[PDB]
Amino acid sequence: XLSLCA
């Protein structure tokens, strides 16, 4: 996500 979906 915002962190992994980087």
Those residues whose C-beta lies under 8 Å from the C-beta of residue 1, and which sit 6 or more positions away, are none
Helix (H) or strand (E) holding 6: none
Which residue type occupies 4? Answer: L
Token pair recorded at residue 5: 């979906």
| Residue indicated by tokens 């915002």 | 2
Identify the experimental approach: NMR
Q: Residue 2: what residue type?
A: L
- How many angstroms separate the CA atoms of 5 and 2, rounded? 5
Q: Enumerate residues preceding breaks in the chain (C to N > 2.5 Å).
A: none
Residue 2: DSSP 8-state: T
